[model samples]
Target: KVFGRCELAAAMKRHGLDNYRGYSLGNWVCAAKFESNFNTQATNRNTDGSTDYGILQINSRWWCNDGRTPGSRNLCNIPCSALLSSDITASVNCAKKIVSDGNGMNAWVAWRNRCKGTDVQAWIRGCRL
Candidate 1:
């Protein structure tokens, strides 16, 4: 499922990402836009034999178990496939766990390069949140 900017903002807000771990909803929205373009089924393989999955691109090496990451910890305790679902509940929850684990939004390189220190609210502009 591909979500528009406002739609993804609203959804992330509903999932408690509006201010989770000091990262605002727009931060998530901006990262999602750069990470996966709001596509629920996005996937990217890493050079370390791990993969990223879902909108926020949760990684296989430390978050979800893909059975092929070589040394997955599965800290989120979910199958990597779960992140690919359009429902997004699992993806949201896993993302929360990622932040709570002290990685913060910087867990996503896109957030570091594109969202951090930027006026992220623009990502959700014109959306009534």
Candidate 2:
């Protein structure tokens, strides 16, 4: 899946993000980047044993809310894929919506605002344009 400045905006737009700055964007990308290394198909478990198996790093135990070992066909029971796959993206979108009520608040958002006027401008604009 594509992810960058413009791509990020595109992703947020899918959720109706117009402002594209401040905490809204900040929180969303932060969660995405931190959780899954920006990979919508990522699946990982914390060293502590808690699991996050999706691009958004959904704690399947909590987000999926199903028997992990049984591995039911229930959609929520299984890990979400991504926007393209219709699984992981759903998870990330869920996260974005909850974070900004469907507006998106990820790392890109934070970098754009908190570091907007700093040396990151070149990097930010580069990806966007």
Off by over 4 Å in 1: none
RMSD, one per candidate, in order: 0.9, 6.4
Give the per-residue lDDT digits (tens) of candidate 2, residues 1-129: 535545664465466433433444434444455555566656665554445555455554434542442442333443433332523446644454444544333223433455444443232343342
Colliding pairs, model 1: none
Put down candidate 1 lDDT per residue, 1-129, tens digits, no spaces: 999889888888888888888887888899999999899999999999999999989989899899997867999899999999988899999888888877787778999998899999888889988
Name the lDDT of candidate 1. 0.89
- Per-candidate clashes, comma-separated: 0, 21
Worst 10 residues of 2 by lDDT: 120-129
RMSD from true fold, candidate 2: 6.4
